[PDB]
Protein backbone atom coordinates (compact mmCIF):
# COMPACT_ATOMS: atom_id res chain seq x y z
CA UNK A 1 0.00 0.00 0.00
CA UNK A 2 2.82 2.43 -0.90
CA UNK A 3 3.29 4.97 -2.12
CA UNK A 4 1.18 6.21 -5.06
CA UNK A 5 -1.80 6.39 -2.76
CA UNK A 6 -1.31 10.14 -3.11
CA UNK A 7 -3.79 10.27 -0.25
CA UNK A 8 -3.74 9.93 3.53
CA UNK A 9 -6.57 8.21 5.49
CA UNK A 10 -6.23 4.56 4.53
CA UNK A 11 -9.06 2.59 6.13
CA UNK A 12 -7.87 1.06 9.41
CA UNK A 13 -5.77 -1.97 8.58
CA UNK A 14 -7.59 -2.26 5.35
CA UNK A 15 -10.87 -2.68 7.19
CA UNK A 16 -13.35 0.02 6.37
CA UNK A 17 -16.06 -1.36 8.58
CA UNK A 18 -14.26 -1.18 11.88
CA UNK A 19 -14.39 2.26 13.40
CA UNK A 20 -11.16 4.10 13.27
CA UNK A 21 -9.01 5.11 10.37
CA UNK A 22 -5.35 5.20 9.46
CA UNK A 23 -3.68 8.56 9.81
CA UNK A 24 -0.12 9.65 10.36
CA UNK A 25 -0.98 10.09 13.98
CA UNK A 26 -2.54 6.65 13.99
CA UNK A 27 0.13 4.97 12.03
CA UNK A 28 3.36 6.62 11.19
CA UNK A 29 6.59 4.73 11.44
CA UNK A 30 7.80 7.35 13.83
CA UNK A 31 4.65 7.09 15.91
CA UNK A 32 4.39 3.38 15.59
CA UNK A 33 7.93 2.85 16.52
CA UNK A 34 7.38 5.18 19.44
CA UNK A 35 4.17 3.50 20.59
CA UNK A 36 5.56 -0.02 20.22
CA UNK A 37 8.23 0.94 22.71
CA UNK A 38 7.40 1.83 26.36
CA UNK A 39 6.36 -0.11 29.45
CA UNK A 40 2.61 -0.15 28.84
CA UNK A 41 3.30 -1.72 25.49
CA UNK A 42 6.18 -4.19 25.08
CA UNK A 43 4.23 -7.38 25.53
CA UNK A 44 6.20 -10.56 26.26
CA UNK A 45 8.19 -8.77 28.94
CA UNK A 46 7.82 -9.16 32.70
CA UNK A 47 4.99 -7.01 34.04
CA UNK A 48 6.87 -6.06 37.20
CA UNK A 49 9.73 -4.70 35.13
CA UNK A 50 7.32 -2.55 33.11
CA UNK A 51 5.51 -1.15 36.13
CA UNK A 52 8.78 -0.05 37.53
CA UNK A 53 9.57 1.94 34.44
CA UNK A 54 6.17 3.48 34.38
CA UNK A 55 5.97 3.82 38.10
CA UNK A 56 9.38 5.27 38.46
CA UNK A 57 8.73 7.85 35.79
CA UNK A 58 5.45 9.08 37.14
CA UNK A 59 6.54 9.34 40.75
CA UNK A 60 9.39 11.57 39.65
CA UNK A 61 7.03 13.73 37.58
CA UNK A 62 4.50 14.24 40.37
CA UNK A 63 6.88 16.01 42.68
CA UNK A 64 7.27 19.12 40.63
CA UNK A 65 3.67 20.17 40.61
CA UNK A 66 2.96 19.45 44.25
CA UNK A 67 6.09 21.20 45.49
CA UNK A 68 5.69 24.30 43.32
CA UNK A 69 1.94 24.86 43.69
CA UNK A 70 1.58 23.41 47.16
CA UNK A 71 0.06 25.14 50.13
CA UNK A 72 3.64 25.98 51.22
CA UNK A 73 5.38 27.06 48.04
CA UNK A 74 7.01 29.15 49.73
CA UNK A 75 8.52 27.56 52.81
CA UNK A 76 11.67 25.96 54.08
CA UNK A 77 9.53 23.85 56.30
CA UNK A 78 7.67 22.82 53.23
CA UNK A 79 10.62 23.31 51.01
CA UNK A 80 9.90 20.05 49.24
CA UNK A 81 8.61 17.81 51.91
CA UNK A 82 5.44 18.35 49.96
CA UNK A 83 7.08 15.69 47.81
CA UNK A 84 5.74 13.55 50.59
CA UNK A 85 2.48 14.63 49.02
CA UNK A 86 3.56 13.43 45.68
CA UNK A 87 4.33 10.17 47.43
CA UNK A 88 0.93 9.94 49.01
CA UNK A 89 -0.61 10.20 45.66
CA UNK A 90 1.27 7.14 44.48
CA UNK A 91 0.10 5.32 47.61
CA UNK A 92 -3.48 6.11 46.64
CA UNK A 93 -2.79 5.54 42.94
CA UNK A 94 -1.50 2.07 43.85
CA UNK A 95 -4.77 1.29 45.62
CA UNK A 96 -6.80 2.24 42.54
CA UNK A 97 -4.45 -0.01 40.57
CA UNK A 98 -4.80 -2.87 43.05
CA UNK A 99 -8.59 -2.76 43.18
CA UNK A 100 -8.80 -2.60 39.42
CA UNK A 101 -6.70 -5.76 39.28
CA UNK A 102 -9.57 -7.55 40.97
CA UNK A 103 -11.53 -7.25 37.78
CA UNK A 104 -9.13 -9.91 36.48
CA UNK A 105 -9.33 -13.24 38.26
CA UNK A 106 -6.85 -15.96 38.93
CA UNK A 107 -8.53 -18.67 36.89
CA UNK A 108 -7.96 -16.62 35.00
CA UNK A 109 -8.55 -17.21 31.34
CA UNK A 110 -5.37 -15.26 31.23
CA UNK A 111 -5.45 -12.19 29.17
CA UNK A 112 -8.31 -10.24 27.81
CA UNK A 113 -5.69 -8.68 25.51
CA UNK A 114 -5.83 -9.40 21.85
CA UNK A 115 -4.24 -12.60 20.71
CA UNK A 116 -2.87 -11.23 17.47
CA UNK A 117 -0.88 -8.46 16.03
CA UNK A 118 -2.09 -6.41 13.19
CA UNK A 119 -1.02 -8.05 9.95
CA UNK A 120 -3.10 -10.76 11.48
CA UNK A 121 -0.05 -12.84 12.14
CA UNK A 122 -2.26 -14.83 14.43
CA UNK A 123 0.58 -15.50 16.82
CA UNK A 124 1.08 -14.89 20.52
CA UNK A 125 -0.67 -13.60 23.59
CA UNK A 126 -0.18 -10.48 25.83
CA UNK A 127 -0.31 -11.29 29.58
CA UNK A 128 -0.30 -7.84 31.10
CA UNK A 129 -3.84 -8.65 32.05
CA UNK A 130 -4.71 -11.52 34.39
CA UNK A 131 -4.49 -11.46 38.11
CA UNK A 132 -0.89 -12.40 38.60
CA UNK A 133 0.39 -10.22 35.85
CA UNK A 134 -1.44 -7.08 36.85
CA UNK A 135 -0.43 -7.41 40.48
CA UNK A 136 3.21 -7.63 39.69
CA UNK A 137 2.82 -4.56 37.64
CA UNK A 138 1.23 -2.59 40.40
CA UNK A 139 3.90 -3.63 42.85
CA UNK A 140 6.39 -2.35 40.34
CA UNK A 141 4.53 0.90 40.09
CA UNK A 142 4.43 1.30 43.80
CA UNK A 143 8.11 0.59 43.95
CA UNK A 144 8.83 2.72 40.97
CA UNK A 145 6.69 5.56 42.21
CA UNK A 146 8.05 5.86 45.68
CA UNK A 147 11.56 5.83 44.34
CA UNK A 148 11.01 8.33 41.60
CA UNK A 149 9.63 10.50 44.28
CA UNK A 150 12.62 10.29 46.56
CA UNK A 151 15.17 10.83 43.90
CA UNK A 152 13.52 13.94 42.55
CA UNK A 153 13.43 15.31 46.06
CA UNK A 154 17.02 14.34 46.41
CA UNK A 155 18.23 16.51 43.62
CA UNK A 156 15.95 19.33 44.71
CA UNK A 157 17.14 18.91 48.30
CA UNK A 158 20.54 20.02 46.99
CA UNK A 159 19.68 21.33 43.53
CA UNK A 160 21.78 24.31 42.29
CA UNK A 161 19.96 24.19 38.95
CA UNK A 162 17.76 25.93 38.62
CA UNK A 163 17.58 27.73 41.96
CA UNK B 1 -13.89 -8.64 0.72
CA UNK B 2 -12.24 -10.41 3.64
CA UNK B 3 -14.66 -11.91 6.17
CA UNK B 4 -13.85 -15.40 7.42
CA UNK B 5 -16.13 -17.27 9.80
CA UNK B 6 -13.09 -19.49 10.39
CA UNK B 7 -11.21 -16.74 12.20
CA UNK B 8 -13.59 -14.43 14.05
CA UNK B 9 -10.65 -12.37 15.28
CA UNK B 10 -9.17 -10.58 12.23
CA UNK B 11 -12.80 -10.03 11.22
CA UNK B 12 -13.09 -7.87 14.33
CA UNK B 13 -10.56 -5.40 15.73
CA UNK B 14 -9.25 -8.37 17.54
CA UNK B 15 -5.77 -7.65 16.33
CA UNK B 16 -3.31 -5.82 18.55
CA UNK B 17 -2.45 -2.53 16.97
CA UNK B 18 1.19 -2.46 15.86
CA UNK B 19 1.84 -0.67 19.11
CA UNK B 20 2.08 -4.11 20.73
CA UNK B 21 5.77 -5.06 20.36
CA UNK B 22 6.60 -8.58 21.55
CA UNK B 23 10.33 -7.84 21.35
CA UNK B 24 13.27 -8.97 23.48
CA UNK B 25 13.73 -7.27 26.89
CA UNK B 26 15.66 -4.70 28.96
CA UNK B 27 19.03 -4.80 30.82
CA UNK B 28 19.82 -7.32 33.60
CA UNK B 29 19.29 -4.62 36.22
CA UNK B 30 15.91 -6.32 36.48
CA UNK B 31 17.47 -9.09 38.53
CA UNK B 32 17.68 -6.43 41.23
CA UNK B 33 14.12 -5.09 41.03
CA UNK B 34 12.60 -8.57 40.95
CA UNK B 35 14.31 -9.20 44.29
CA UNK B 36 13.10 -6.09 46.13
CA UNK B 37 9.73 -5.48 44.45
CA UNK B 38 8.51 -8.99 45.26
CA UNK B 39 6.61 -8.21 48.50
CA UNK B 40 4.43 -5.70 46.63
CA UNK B 41 3.59 -8.13 43.82
CA UNK B 42 1.28 -10.36 45.86
CA UNK B 43 -1.93 -8.28 45.59
CA UNK B 44 -4.46 -8.11 48.43
CA UNK B 45 -1.43 -8.22 50.70
CA UNK B 46 -0.46 -4.94 49.04
CA UNK B 47 -4.04 -3.63 49.22
CA UNK B 48 -3.78 -4.03 52.98
CA UNK B 49 -0.25 -2.62 53.39
CA UNK B 50 -1.31 0.60 51.65
CA UNK B 51 -4.52 0.99 53.66
CA UNK B 52 -2.63 0.36 56.89
CA UNK B 53 -0.12 2.71 55.31
CA UNK B 54 -2.90 5.17 56.10
CA UNK B 55 -1.43 4.92 59.58
CA UNK B 56 1.05 7.44 58.20
CA UNK B 57 -1.68 10.07 57.81
CA UNK B 58 -2.65 9.67 61.47
CA UNK B 59 0.98 9.99 62.55
CA UNK B 60 1.54 13.05 60.37
CA UNK B 61 -1.43 14.97 61.79
CA UNK B 62 -1.11 13.99 65.44
CA UNK B 63 2.26 15.71 65.18
CA UNK B 64 2.21 18.89 63.09
CA UNK B 65 3.52 22.25 64.27
CA UNK B 66 2.73 24.49 61.28
CA UNK B 67 -0.95 24.06 60.43
CA UNK B 68 -3.46 26.68 61.55
CA UNK B 69 -4.79 25.18 64.80
CA UNK B 70 -4.11 28.22 66.99
CA UNK B 71 -5.88 31.59 67.04
CA UNK B 72 -2.93 32.60 67.42
CA UNK B 73 -4.26 34.73 70.21
CA UNK B 74 -6.88 37.44 70.09
CA UNK B 75 -9.53 39.03 72.26
CA UNK B 76 -12.79 37.77 70.74
CA UNK B 77 -15.58 39.98 69.46
CA UNK B 78 -18.64 40.06 71.57
CA UNK B 79 -20.13 40.80 69.23
CA UNK B 80 -23.66 41.80 67.85
CA UNK B 81 -25.20 41.79 71.28
CA UNK B 82 -22.37 40.05 73.17
Amino acid sequence: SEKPTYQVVQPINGDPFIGSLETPVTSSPLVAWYLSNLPGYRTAVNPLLRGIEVGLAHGFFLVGPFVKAGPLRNTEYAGAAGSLAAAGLVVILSICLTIYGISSFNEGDPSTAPSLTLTGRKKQPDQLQTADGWAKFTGGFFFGGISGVIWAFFLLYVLDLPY
Amino acid sequence: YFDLEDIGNTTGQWDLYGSDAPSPYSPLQSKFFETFAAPFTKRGLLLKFLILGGGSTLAYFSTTASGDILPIVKGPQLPPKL
Binding site: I99 | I51, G54, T57, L58, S62, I69
Partner: peptide, 26 residues
Amino acid sequence: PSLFVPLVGLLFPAVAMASLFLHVEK
Protein backbone atom coordinates in the same frame (compact mmCIF):
# COMPACT_ATOMS: atom_id res chain seq x y z
CA PRO C 1 -7.40 14.00 70.16
CA SER C 2 -9.89 15.62 67.78
CA LEU C 3 -7.03 15.86 65.28
CA PHE C 4 -6.82 12.10 64.89
CA VAL C 5 -10.47 11.31 64.18
CA PRO C 6 -11.59 13.50 61.25
CA LEU C 7 -8.89 11.85 59.11
CA VAL C 8 -10.06 8.35 60.00
CA GLY C 9 -13.36 9.87 59.00
CA LEU C 10 -11.45 10.18 55.73
CA LEU C 11 -9.59 6.88 55.89
CA PHE C 12 -13.05 5.35 56.20
CA PRO C 13 -14.33 6.69 52.83
CA ALA C 14 -11.16 5.29 51.25
CA VAL C 15 -11.86 1.92 52.87
CA ALA C 16 -15.62 2.06 52.26
CA MET C 17 -15.38 3.18 48.62
CA ALA C 18 -12.83 0.46 47.91
CA SER C 19 -14.84 -2.34 49.52
CA LEU C 20 -18.11 -1.23 47.91
CA PHE C 21 -16.40 -1.06 44.52
CA LEU C 22 -15.35 -4.69 44.91
CA HIS C 23 -18.89 -5.56 46.00
CA VAL C 24 -20.61 -3.91 43.03
CA GLU C 25 -18.35 -5.30 40.29
CA LYS C 26 -18.58 -8.85 41.63
